[PDB]
Amino acid sequence: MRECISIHVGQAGVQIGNACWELYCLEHGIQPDGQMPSDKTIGGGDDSFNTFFSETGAGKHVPRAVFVDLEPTVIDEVRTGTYRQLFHPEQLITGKEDAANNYARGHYTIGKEIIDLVLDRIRKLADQCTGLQGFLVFHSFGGGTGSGFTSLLMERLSVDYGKKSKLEFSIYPAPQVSTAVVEPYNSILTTHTTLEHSDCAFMVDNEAIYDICRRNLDIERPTYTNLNRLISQIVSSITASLRFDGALNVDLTEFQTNLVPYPRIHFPLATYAPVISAEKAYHEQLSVAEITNACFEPANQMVKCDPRHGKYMACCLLYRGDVVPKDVNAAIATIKTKRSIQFVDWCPTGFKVGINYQPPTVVPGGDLAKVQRAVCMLSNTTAIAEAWARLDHKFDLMYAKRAFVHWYVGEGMEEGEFSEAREDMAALEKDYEEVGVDSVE
Amino acid sequence: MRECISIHVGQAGVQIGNACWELYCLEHGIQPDGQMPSDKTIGGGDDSFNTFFSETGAGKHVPRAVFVDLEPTVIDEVRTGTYRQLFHPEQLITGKEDAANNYARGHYTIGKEIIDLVLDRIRKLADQCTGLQGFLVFHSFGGGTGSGFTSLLMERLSVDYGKKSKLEFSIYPAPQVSTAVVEPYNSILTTHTTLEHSDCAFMVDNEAIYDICRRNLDIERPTYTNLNRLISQIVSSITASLRFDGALNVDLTEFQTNLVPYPRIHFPLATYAPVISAEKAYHEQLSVAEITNACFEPANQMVKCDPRHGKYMACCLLYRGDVVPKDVNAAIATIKTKRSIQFVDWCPTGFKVGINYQPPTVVPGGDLAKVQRAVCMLSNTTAIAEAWARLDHKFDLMYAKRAFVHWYVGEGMEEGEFSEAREDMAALEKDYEEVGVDSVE
Amino acid sequence: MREIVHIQAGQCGNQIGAKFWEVISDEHGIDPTGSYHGDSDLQLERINVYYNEATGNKYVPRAILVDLEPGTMDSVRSGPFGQIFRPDNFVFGQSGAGNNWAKGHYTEGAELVDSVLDVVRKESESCDCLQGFQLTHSLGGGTGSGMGTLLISKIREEYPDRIMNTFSVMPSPKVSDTVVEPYNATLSVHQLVENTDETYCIDNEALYDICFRTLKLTTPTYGDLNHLVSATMSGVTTCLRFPGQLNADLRKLAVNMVPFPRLHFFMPGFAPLTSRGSQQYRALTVPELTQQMFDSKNMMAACDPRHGRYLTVAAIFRGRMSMKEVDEQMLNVQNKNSSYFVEWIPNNVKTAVCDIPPRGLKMSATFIGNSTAIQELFKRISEQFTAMFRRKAFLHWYTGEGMDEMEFTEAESNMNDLVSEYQQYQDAT
Amino acid sequence: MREIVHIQAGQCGNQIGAKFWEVISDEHGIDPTGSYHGDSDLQLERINVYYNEATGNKYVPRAILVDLEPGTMDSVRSGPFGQIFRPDNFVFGQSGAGNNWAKGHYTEGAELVDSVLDVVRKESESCDCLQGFQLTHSLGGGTGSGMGTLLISKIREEYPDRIMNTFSVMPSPKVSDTVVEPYNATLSVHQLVENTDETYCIDNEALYDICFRTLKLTTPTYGDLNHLVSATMSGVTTCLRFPGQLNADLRKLAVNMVPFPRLHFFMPGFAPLTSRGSQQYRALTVPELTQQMFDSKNMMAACDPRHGRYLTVAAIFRGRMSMKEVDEQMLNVQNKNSSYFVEWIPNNVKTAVCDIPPRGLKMSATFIGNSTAIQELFKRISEQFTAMFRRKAFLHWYTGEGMDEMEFTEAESNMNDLVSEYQQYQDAT
């Protein structure tokens, strides 16, 4: 049976893992103590699907999850919370000190000597599965372990596994609001191994989801509990075809074939249709043509990024629930008519529709409610290049002044590592200028 | 199905929208909470017609209405009144300050930056409809947002929609009674975009409906609740053929073909037959020849305007209820005999009869009652030119003294805008002097 | 046998047409479901003409409905006979004409004529032999004036040898239910001179006159004006459907009734029209029907027939008669009215005698007459037209849809040549 | 008697195939357990064709299922007819193709074709004589495009003299459910020119069109597009299974229908398709079926048939008919459409008349036609292909599985030669 290995890294990765595994346990019926008392009433069905859940003989279910953060403070919430007895008790903590927001403590100093517990734990976990693999990595750019330790975890998993698909779901630094002053240093050093090893890098952002939680959801004070559920609804309908029974399922290998033209332009900028309130769950039809047109306006992109100032290359409409496959093509010939939704010449096909027909469920405790259908559009546009130039500019403004850099080179890393990461991002931004421009004859 | 988009603007537009949507909900059977418990007893009929009402799957009905006023004080009556849960919760308020009665705050200062919410909301509303469109705009001249913000809303909807019919129902400043001293400045600047963009401008007035509420209805103290119902009875029988089953229906495109000779003389001066009391609902036959002869006397025009001092060009008799089409032609050959009811040479056809046969209903709470038939005559006469010369004279008397004008040019607008709006109204009044005069040979 | 296709354009067209297929049905004895439950076997021999068969004993009219712009759709469907028309025939679009000619002939007509003629050809080849293309349309309006004469430009093009009768409701001198109406008559008579073999000029005033001056009806509704038109519409094709003693097709009329190829604008009459319960003070005989047919207050075109000379007329008699009283009553009228006819034609009146009356009546008739008195229906419009066109009054709703000013002067030149070729034969020589 | 093996590749393949064996079952009167409970004895004579016998009175289809990569496994097993297929036939692997051609033809196809052909040979030698190898696959996808044409490279190799029909669902000009789709069509038509005798070009747009323009269905699901395909799939082998008055094998079609050995891409039609309850306003006759078959809105390949000349067509009629109305309706179409056919062929249409209708119907048909209008299905892909290939757009997911750039230019050279050998006969001479 096809399966994934969800490897959360950092505090951002573990905090998202609080709610991704809160969502999975409610869809399948698994209580916070491993049992399945929902399907015992009916008496049939293996709904704790082996994509995400190892099953032991005593009826208990164990996830495929391992997470490393180099700080006990985050995981001790998991080891004392509601999901204490659910997970396996090897949630790898062992950090005698936090990374302190740098890539050099990090890829080199304390990420090493803890990685020996990490890779052996994945080998003890990967060898229980027959069939498809895929590493669902969860981290953030800008942090210390989400940037540094993931970079060590990719070059040590692109060797012991080779050509396996790696979907890594990174939280990207916002161009206007940054919760650290050294976050432009970490989010340029982590690109040098995201570009090489991880085949598909889902970037989301915190400011573009703040506006969604204010405008659509109408929440005036959104905490980090209410942001991570919206990423959790996205991550569910990315790996929904591996579990549920759809009319057009899209495997994790079918992303790599479709979303990714060239081996170094894999940054596809997820979206969703979260216009539930749920006061506005009435007053509104929410048909197939409605939720597909939610991707038109740049007030619903999950990244602070304007798609109208760039081409598209390839999109991937992934539906949920009561979707009829006829209504989809009405909502696609419409989009290919609109002249600001701009494509390149070299991709005339455009779209790809994955219709799963299990409806998205509702986490009790807010903040949206039971809609009958959804969409998670994944589209690598050319417009993500202007989202990086507002981050190379933050790097270059404090690289001329030689600021903050004695805590990077005084931890094992050489000071020449920074310009090696600048010559990628200068040349990787140069790649998006060529691909969007068509050739004339 | 054919449909309209009712866009109220200003406080005058929203206050009329309190009673236009009070009338529609009572004819079709829709309660103030979206349901239709009237037709559930019979069990058939789609009477919540899709001209005015979007239908969601939960049985609730949502109107086609959006209204912008740049002041929260007006719409917070709607958001707390009886029609709270009926409308969609995007009733666009967002004004941190009122317009303060000028065209420059207005078309330029605070009308801009709020219009970005407006046009996108219409696009989210227009793309749910297949077939006929028509923008039922509601505003007043003289005000700040009814004059200024409508002028920005017309030049931004004559580009994103092109050639769609726009029926805008303006309340015109009375020649004797004015509730503002700067109202002659606003009602000459709003003509420069009413003349160009809005294809058909229904002018009504407050003094000519005050006399109707005193003489016919016999109400000694008519508040603004009792005036807006008489406009609501007019607006119903303008867009009655789009809903109900008549013997001669008149589409909104059939107005443009008939009422409007030349592209800049579209000002047609509505009327009605409101001689109900309802003590005088007895004592009186109210036949077809009676209610058609109500347009003869200039004590029943809705504008303070004497039709006997001008020609007519084209009329449009629109009936309701128990009308037999034979009785109409008796009441028309009569009118073509009377020598003060004067036509031009170049229109020998004259009239056009639209017989809808659904009777006009009664809003409970006064002030008229159940008559069996009605008429809403729409006739662009030459006599409206003397209704403007009593407003250009109010403009010119305080333009020589350079009064009130530092709050117009000190808000972004140039002081040269005033003479550009005078050279229209001088030349537009010059157009009515040529059309009424026949050519001799 | 000889088969007819009935086309309905303009909202005036199907309203006459919905009453038309109720007169035809009760004349053949056919219920709303198409099941034949007639009295005799004599009315099954030519069901083939109007009603082609279906699977189990059911009959469907060959009725194309071009005019069901959706305000009229769910009234004709939700009517008396909405369960008799074939639902693929209901051909329409959205955003109807708007009492505009150019939005019937150039813009919305061009994006609908392909969907009509894909059903016209599928109703032609389900037939042994066609001759008839009845088009019930009206001048003055939108669809009935621009799109009604767009199909005749196409159907005569794909069928140059079919009898094309168009029962054309015309404007009035006083009853003006359309302000743009002298444009939709000038631009449509320009099409109906070139492209029809016969066309019947029917007005509403002479239908309002009969329901007051003769039938004494209190409130004549729109159903009771169409019930008089349809009694002529089933009176021209009577000899097609029923046996007789002197038959007349839609072509023995339109070879006799028309001298010159442009002079084919007819005025239809009907008799007996009278007002009663079951006590009426008269006697239905052949000289009784004759005086009422020729009476100037029982035309339908609303012109005075004694102002001009009849070119030739056709009296399609029905019921059981005697041919001597037919051929001698048609003689004495022609002699008493020697100036009221054309002198230089041998015999003006022809006769057509069927053998089956209507259901309730004992005898009936139909006066179809070609007269020079219809010069008045074309002079009034051509005075109303050149009054509007001189000022260029309503033209920016037409030139803004693709037309040119040099098609308006083409259309008034054609109608002014009919008046020239009617004033000539109205004069004596 | 003559026996057929049905192979199902790609996830589009068994979804059509699960509906396919439900139409075949109800045509022979066979329950989900394979127990025969039919009405007459006339449908047992050729159970041998599709259903070989089992121990106690039970029947098993000779259905190999290559495509059950395990997302589709426990839906076809847990379906209506999961208790009818032989469970050893469910041949699959792990880690399916991924909408990749090279992961269907070179990497996972090579480690599965040995396990398929070990079941193909065990279903060939349980037969008296084979002729038929039906392959229900789809272009555009993964398994259905690389592995579906890996078996045809092997099965035609081990059987050079069998009729190889592949009912190939093709890409669309607008409906793009696959971003890589102009690669999986170019690389698979390169295989299906060399290795098949006939292949039927079916699109989803012309199946979406019929369920809206003709069948008037509100929400056509994926079952109701396969229910139209399968009504053709049981319409080619009708004369094999049932007696007739002019029989036609899968080889009398594929000797007549194909002029030159590369020109074998067909477009299938079906009639009667209409939308009703139990009240429909028509009559099932032989001229009624004919106009619908040849109608341009009842193809399935989503090209305009009036853009090109039909080379030759085959009208496989069913039900009780009359051969004069068959041979004369097929004559009048060929004369009215003298430019729409090829002039330099004597008679283009052939006829095939069986004697058993479907279950509910009285008559039916199947229009299988070889046209030059299918040049449009190959020109659109060859424009979408050379747009992607010029930039070398998606090639590193294919050359990273073993291919070379000099197989892409081989595949576009072959498809561009079909368009050259279709533009020629579309021209007049």
Ligand SMILES: CC(=O)O[C@H]1C(=O)[C@@]2(C)[C@H]([C@H](OC(=O)c3ccccc3)[C@]3(O)C[C@H](OC(=O)[C@H](O)[C@@H](NC(=O)c4ccccc4)c4ccccc4)C(C)=C1C3(C)C)[C@]1(OC(C)=O)CO[C@@H]1C[C@@H]2O
């Ligand atoms: C007791 C009796 O004899 O009653 C007569 C009758 O009184 C009179 C007044 C009838 C009556 O007609 C009308 O009053 C009338 C109403 C609307 C429009 C036109 C006429 C009659 O209603 C009409 C009816 O006509 C028919 O039956 C014909 O077949 C007629 N049918 C229809 O028009 C028709 C009506 C409803 C449903 C279906 C068909 C017809 C005529 C020509 C071609 C086909 C059919 C008849 C003779 C009568 C009544 C019943 C009172 C008259 O009309 C006709 C068409 O015959 C009006 O002047 C004639 C003279 C008749 O004597």
Ligand SMILES: CC(=O)O[C@H]1C(=O)[C@@]2(C)[C@H]([C@H](OC(=O)c3ccccc3)[C@]3(O)C[C@H](OC(=O)[C@H](O)[C@@H](NC(=O)c4ccccc4)c4ccccc4)C(C)=C1C3(C)C)[C@]1(OC(C)=O)CO[C@@H]1C[C@@H]2O
């Ligand atoms: C009262 C009556 O006569 O009902 C008809 C009917 O109304 C119509 C509309 C049927 C109906 O078909 C459909 O609506 C339809 C649905 C999905 C996909 C395709 C069609 C019918 O459902 C389909 C059904 O078809 C059959 O029975 C054939 O044997 C057909 N069987 C199946 O497709 C089938 C369906 C379910 C289970 C098993 C088999 C067939 C055709 C070719 C080869 C083998 C079998 C028929 C005649 C009818 C109904 C029942 C309404 C029509 O279709 C067929 C295949 O006959 C649609 O247009 C035709 C014309 C028929 O008159």
Ligand SMILES: Nc1nc2c(ncn2[C@@H]2O[C@H](COP(=O)(O)OP(=O)(O)OP(=O)(O)O)[C@@H](O)[C@H]2O)c(=O)[nH]1
């Ligand atoms: N959405 C979301 N973002 C978070 C969360 N926690 C931190 N972030 C974001 O992640 C970035 C900081 O990285 P962290 O993950 O906190 O850092 P870390 O990986 O623990 O690394 P060090 O603390 O530096 O060792 C900032 O941009 C935060 O806004 C969370 O729970 N949800």
Ligand SMILES: Nc1nc2c(ncn2[C@@H]2O[C@H](COP(=O)(O)OP(=O)(O)OP(=O)(O)O)[C@@H](O)[C@H]2O)c(=O)[nH]1
């Ligand atoms: N009939 C009617 N007239 C009104 C109403 N409210 C205001 N008016 C008239 O409208 C004019 C004033 O314009 P308002 O609509 O109040 O002004 P506004 O559009 O809100 O603009 P500012 O307040 O200037 O921003 C005066 O002539 C009033 O008599 C109403 O509810 N009904």
Ligand SMILES: Nc1nc2c(ncn2[C@@H]2O[C@H](COP(=O)(O)OP(=O)(O)O)[C@@H](O)[C@H]2O)c(=O)[nH]1
């Ligand atoms: N006799 C008759 N005349 C009609 C009817 N409806 C409209 N009219 C006349 O038709 C003309 C108006 O055209 P109409 O058919 O309604 O416009 P259209 O829908 O644009 O073709 C006027 O002269 C009306 O008096 C009807 O049902 N019967």
Ligand SMILES: Nc1nc2c(ncn2[C@@H]2O[C@H](COP(=O)(O)OP(=O)(O)O)[C@@H](O)[C@H]2O)c(=O)[nH]1
């Ligand atoms: N008619 C039909 N088409 C299908 C079905 N499933 C997928 N498709 C079409 O098949 C193509 C996608 O290929 P698919 O069979 O799902 O991929 P595969 O599993 O890799 O072979 C697209 O053109 C889809 O529209 C089906 O059940 N019926």
Ligand SMILES: [Mg+2]
């Ligand atoms: Mg941390």
Ligand SMILES: [Mg+2]
């Ligand atoms: Mg105000």
